[PDB]
From a paper:
The protein kinase ERK2 is recurrently mutated in human squamous cell carcinomas and other tumors. Though distributed throughout the primary sequence, the most recurrent mutations (E81K, R135K, D321N, and E322K) map to a three-dimensional hotspot at the so-called common docking (CD) site within the ERK2 catalytic domain. This site is located at one end of the docking recruitment site (DRS), a shallow groove opposite the catalytic cleft that serves as a hub for interactions integral to ERK signaling. The DRS binds to short linear sequence motifs termed docking sites (or D-sites), often found in intrinsically disordered regions of interacting proteins.
To acquire structural insights into differential binding affinity between WT and CD mutant ERK2, we solved the co-crystal structure of WT ERK2 in complex with the ISG20 D-peptide (ISG20-pep, corresponding to residues 168 – 181 of human ISG20 with the sequence acetyl-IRARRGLPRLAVSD-amide). The co-crystal structure, containing a single copy per asymmetric unit, was determined to 1.9 Å resolution, with clear electron density corresponding to the D-peptide bound at the docking groove. ISG20-pep binds the ERK2 docking groove in a largely extended conformation save for a single helical turn at the peptide N-terminus, including the HEPTP motif I-x-x-R-R sequence. At the C-terminus, ISG20-pep residues Leu177′ and Val179′ occupy the hydrophobic pockets ΦL and ΦA in ERK2, mostly forming hydrophobic contacts with residues in αE and the β7-β8 loop. At the ISG20-pep N-terminus, the Ile168′ sidechain occupies the upper hydrophobic pocket (ΦU) of ERK2 (comprising Glu81, Tyr126, Gln130, Arg133). Spatially adjacent to Ile168′, Arg171′ and Arg172′ make salt bridges with Glu79 and Asp319 of ERK2. This explains why cancer hotspot mutations at Glu79 and Asp319 disrupt binding to HEPTP motif sequences. Similarly, Arg133, though not directly contacting the bound peptide, coordinates Glu79, likely stabilizing peptide binding. Lastly, cancer hotspot residue Glu320, as previously indicated by the crystal structure of ERK2 E320K, appears to stabilize the ERK2 L16 loop conformation and consequently orient Asn319 for contact to Arg171′ and Arg172′ in the ISG20-pep. Collectively, these observations suggest that disruption of direct and indirect interactions through cancer-associated ERK2 mutations causes selective loss of interactions with D-sites harboring an I/L-x-x-R-R motif.
Numbering used by the authors:
A (entry chain I): 168 to 181
B (entry chain A): 11 to 174, 184 to 330, 335 to 356
């Protein structure tokens, strides 16, 4: 979802 | 035929290089390399044909997951079973490989408010599709929320889903109080309650309503929500359940910000609406998605619903084995 909508990557480790 | 932790996995030659992932109460899950699509997948082995309840779980999960198509719901890529019904004793269900689940994550790390928001959004976006198909999942819990490193989430484990209870389950901590009060006539609101429990557990890394049985679980629920109001007692129609509630000592409500002093106040407002004792006043999935806490994700143009809603418990295990054989025939060469 985030990638398709152009939002920055959200990683589990952060 | 390759073996994993003593159990056989007869999935070759298409799937190879097995690696143990884990086990639920009904299946053993490994990863494998799919030599057709040239990627690693997950494979769940089920051996259900000896018991009525096992067969039901297998048939329900396969019939539903084969007909669902949604980004936040696990799919079935393939199903392996013997070419004859007499030789069919195991079923192997092949799915997209995910990296972990929310249960295992919450045992290891804090979730930031950004994580919690994004996971909650995806749970409800998936649930919006499920409920639009007129299906109840009925067993939402952290262990069946699959996750990958980019925080994509998929709901899995539909063995208890029904179109809108005595069997064994690994955990009852996410079940709605109206299930425990034998109110019957369960609705989509039981899924919202479970999501409420999962949200609370993301905020604190602890289950909010643990308990050794329903009586103990209800005491945990009432110890936080407080004793039900007069109006709440009217939604409990079962004679014995209502008398039981009336027999309990009065308990005060605990403010959410005392239990979760570091949580986003918007998250607590939405939590309050999901963990509403009265199932008729509990928030519905569409209203939950529109809640201010999820404002950066609510996007009704990008939240698909089922094109059409869906519209067995008295069948013997031999008849269910037939139906299982039939629904899986499409994957045979
Ligand atoms: N597609 C998958 N990708 C990665 N891990 C998975 C996948 N499916 C299941 N798992 C892991 O294996 C565990 C058991 O899976 P589940 O699908 O929940 O099993 P069950 O035995 O059929 N039902 P339950 O008793 O409710 O767990 C899950 O909790 C996940 O950690």
């Amino acid at each position: 979802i985030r990638a398709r909508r152009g939002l920055p990557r959200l990683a589990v480790s952060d | 035929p390759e073996m994993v932790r003593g159990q056989v996995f007869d999935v070759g030659p298409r799937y190879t290089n097995l690696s143990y992932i884990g086990e639920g109460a009904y299946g053993m899950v490994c990863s494998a390399y799919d030599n057709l699509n040239k990627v690693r997948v997950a494979i769940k082995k089920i051996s259900p044909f000896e018991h009525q309840t096992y067969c039901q779980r297998t048939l329900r999960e396969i019939k539903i997951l084969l007909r669902f198509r949604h980004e936040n719901i696990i799919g079935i890529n393939d199903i392996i079973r013997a070419p004859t019904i007499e030789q069919m004793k195991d079923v192997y269900i092949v799915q997209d490989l995910m990296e972990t689940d929310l249960y295992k994550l919450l045992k290891t790390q804090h979730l930031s408010n950004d994580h919690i928001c994004y996971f909650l959004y995806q749970i409800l976006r998936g649930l919006k599709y499920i409920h639009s198909a007129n299906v109840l999942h009925r067993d939402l819990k952290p262990s069946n929320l699959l996750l990958n490193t980019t925080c994509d989430l998929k709901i899995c484990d539909f063995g208890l889903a029904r179109v809108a209870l005595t069997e064994y389950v690994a955990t009852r901590w996410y079940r709605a109080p109206e299930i425990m009060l034998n109110s019957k006539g369960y609705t989509k609101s039981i899924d919202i309650w479970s999501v409420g429990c999962i949200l609370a557990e993301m905020l604190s890394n602890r289950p909010i309503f643990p308990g050794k049985h329903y009586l103990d679980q209800l005491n945990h629920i009432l110890g936080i929500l407080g004793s039900p109001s007069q109006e709440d007692l009217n939604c409990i129609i079962n004679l014995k359940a209502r008398n039981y509630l009336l027999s309990l000592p009065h308990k005060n409500k605990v403010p959410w910000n005392r239990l979760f002093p570091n949580a986003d106040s918007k998250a607590l407002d939405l939590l309050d609406k999901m963990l509403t004792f009265n199932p008729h006043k509990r928030i519905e999935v569409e209203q939950a998605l529109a809640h201010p806490y999820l404002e950066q994700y609510y996007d009704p143009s990008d939240e698909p619903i089922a094109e059409a809603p869906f519209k067995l418990d008295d069948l013997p295990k031999e008849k269910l084995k037939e139906l299982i054989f039939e629904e899986t025939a499409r994957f045979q060469p």
